[PDB]
Design a protein around this motif. Structure first.
Motif, short mmCIF file in Angstrom:
data_model
loop_
_atom_site.label_atom_id
_atom_site.label_comp_id
_atom_site.label_asym_id
_atom_site.label_seq_id
_atom_site.Cartn_x
_atom_site.Cartn_y
_atom_site.Cartn_z
N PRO A 220 0.80 -1.22 0.00
CA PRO A 220 0.00 0.00 0.00
C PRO A 220 0.84 1.27 0.00
O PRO A 220 1.97 1.27 0.48
CB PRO A 220 -0.80 -0.07 1.30
N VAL A 221 0.26 2.34 -0.56
CA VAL A 221 0.78 3.69 -0.41
C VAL A 221 -0.18 4.41 0.54
O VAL A 221 -1.30 3.94 0.77
CB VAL A 221 0.91 4.45 -1.76
N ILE A 222 0.28 5.50 1.14
CA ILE A 222 -0.60 6.36 1.94
C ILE A 222 -1.33 7.27 0.94
O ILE A 222 -0.72 8.16 0.31
CB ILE A 222 0.18 7.15 3.01
N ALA A 223 -2.61 6.99 0.74
CA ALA A 223 -3.47 7.77 -0.15
C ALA A 223 -3.82 9.14 0.45
O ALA A 223 -3.98 10.14 -0.27
CB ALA A 223 -4.74 6.99 -0.44
N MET A 224 -3.97 9.19 1.77
CA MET A 224 -4.25 10.45 2.47
C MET A 224 -3.80 10.29 3.91
O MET A 224 -3.84 9.19 4.46
CB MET A 224 -5.74 10.80 2.45
N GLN A 225 -3.41 11.41 4.50
CA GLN A 225 -3.06 11.41 5.91
C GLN A 225 -3.25 12.75 6.58
O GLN A 225 -3.29 13.77 5.92
CB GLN A 225 -1.62 10.97 6.09
N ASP A 226 -3.42 12.70 7.90
CA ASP A 226 -3.48 13.88 8.75
C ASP A 226 -2.67 13.61 10.01
O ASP A 226 -2.75 12.53 10.59
CB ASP A 226 -4.94 14.19 9.10
N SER A 227 -1.89 14.60 10.44
CA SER A 227 -1.14 14.50 11.70
C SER A 227 -2.08 14.38 12.91
O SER A 227 -1.67 13.87 13.96
CB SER A 227 -0.22 15.71 11.84
N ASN A 228 -3.32 14.84 12.78
CA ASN A 228 -4.35 14.65 13.79
C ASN A 228 -5.24 13.48 13.40
O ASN A 228 -6.08 13.61 12.52
CB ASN A 228 -5.19 15.93 13.97
N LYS A 229 -5.07 12.35 14.08
CA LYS A 229 -5.78 11.12 13.70
C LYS A 229 -7.29 11.31 13.74
O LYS A 229 -8.02 10.67 12.99
CB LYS A 229 -5.39 9.94 14.60
N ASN A 230 -7.76 12.17 14.63
CA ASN A 230 -9.19 12.50 14.71
C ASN A 230 -9.81 13.08 13.43
O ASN A 230 -11.00 12.87 13.19
CB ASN A 230 -9.47 13.45 15.87
N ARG A 231 -9.02 13.78 12.63
CA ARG A 231 -9.50 14.38 11.40
C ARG A 231 -9.67 13.35 10.26
O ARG A 231 -10.37 13.60 9.29
CB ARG A 231 -8.54 15.48 10.93
N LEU A 232 -8.98 12.22 10.37
CA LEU A 232 -9.01 11.20 9.33
C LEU A 232 -8.93 9.84 10.00
O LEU A 232 -7.92 9.14 9.93
CB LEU A 232 -7.85 11.41 8.34
#
Ligand SMILES: [Ca+2]
Length: 317
Positions: free
Chosen positions: A181-193
């Protein structure tokens, strides 16, 4: 497809039966309409664990009275299984049921009307991929979702740690050959994603819709949305803020009383049942899990029930 949303919610339509299993939550629904019936797959949730249930009914007014078929009576079997996704993989003339079991897993079945037919689990990977092991933190590898186009199949997953992962394989090789897998999307705040991705082809356009669950500033579950011209991204915000959400308490009306402040792990009603995961841009309907806002205690014992959002700012019929 509009860039803002408004909804009208049903009351709670489907909750646990009162049987010896003492299931506390019905959760994480997947849904298709096929040959005149709704087919709903859901997680059964309690302190003691998770498995999967099949629920079928003709009419939304009869959802609550529909019998349950506990899929642990099929070869799918006892043990931990959770968060299902059902679709028809047309090249093989087989229904797939994708879910998590500690790995990314699937069952097959030539007939969705035969709940006893779901196979014992197979996995899409030989173990947790390195990129997920490396970035999971103290999250959980959850919420497996397949979508295919005319040449590739994509498998999305979350880690409850702010990463959305995506592997791909060929349409001919599916279910085998999913790559790293690749990281398709990420946020440093896990709550946002946080978890619970949906990925759909938007009919009448060369675009795709991504939905993803988040935990808001009020602690309540809600959905963010993005669109892209490719399943592989890049994703551009559609309605992805608390003040312009895909679905959240502040854009959800109820015909009756507001029975939930959480809009959590759901699925859109589709325009077709095959592996392309299509939706109409018109009259969106979201089958989702909610719960009493006064509920507390251990997460696995929360009284989740399924409800249905109907779009009230629809662009078309
Ligand atoms: Ca799901």
């Amino acid at each position: 497809l509009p860039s803002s949303f408004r909804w009208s919610s049903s009351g709670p339509l489907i909750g646990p039966k009162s049987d010896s299993r003492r299931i506390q939550g019905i959760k994480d629904p997947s849904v298709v309409y096929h040959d005149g019936r709704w087919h709903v797959f859901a997680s059964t949730a309690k302190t003691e664990g998770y498995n999967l249930v099949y629920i079928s009914f003709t009419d939304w007014a009869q959802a609550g009275s529909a019998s349950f078929y506990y899929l642990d009576q099929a070869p799918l079997g006892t043990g931990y299984r959770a968060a299902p996704q059902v679709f028809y993989f047309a090249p093989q003339r087989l229904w797939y049921l994708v879910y998590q079991n500690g790995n990314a897993a699937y069952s097959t079945n030539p007939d969705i009307n035969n709940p006893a037919g779901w196979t014992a689990p197979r996995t899409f990977y030989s173990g947790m991929p390195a990129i997920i092991r490396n970035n999971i933190g103290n999250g959980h590898w959850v919420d497996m979702w397949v979508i295919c186009d005319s040449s590739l199949c994509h498998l999305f997953s979350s880690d409850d740690n702010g990463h959305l992962y995506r592997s791909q394989t060929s349409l001919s090789n599916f279910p085998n050959g999913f790559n790293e897998p690749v990281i398709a999307m990420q946020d440093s705040n896990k709550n946002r994603l946080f978890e619970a991705a949906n990925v759909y082809r938007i009919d009448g356009s060369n675009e795709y819709l991504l939905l993803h669950e988040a935990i808001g500033s009020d602690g309540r579950r809600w959905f963010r949305s993005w669109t892209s011209t490719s399943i592989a991204g890049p994703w551009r915000a559609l309605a992805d803020q608390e003040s312009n959400p895909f679905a959240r308490a502040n854009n959800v009306a109820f015909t009756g009383n507001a029975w939930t402040r959480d809009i959590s792990h759901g699925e859109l009603i589709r325009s077709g049942n095959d592996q392309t995961l299509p939706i109409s841009p018109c009259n969106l309907r979201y089958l989702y899990q909610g719960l009493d806002p006064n509920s507390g205690g251990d997460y696995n014992s929360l009284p989740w029930k399924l409800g249905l959002l109907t779009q009230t700012n629809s662009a078309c019929a």
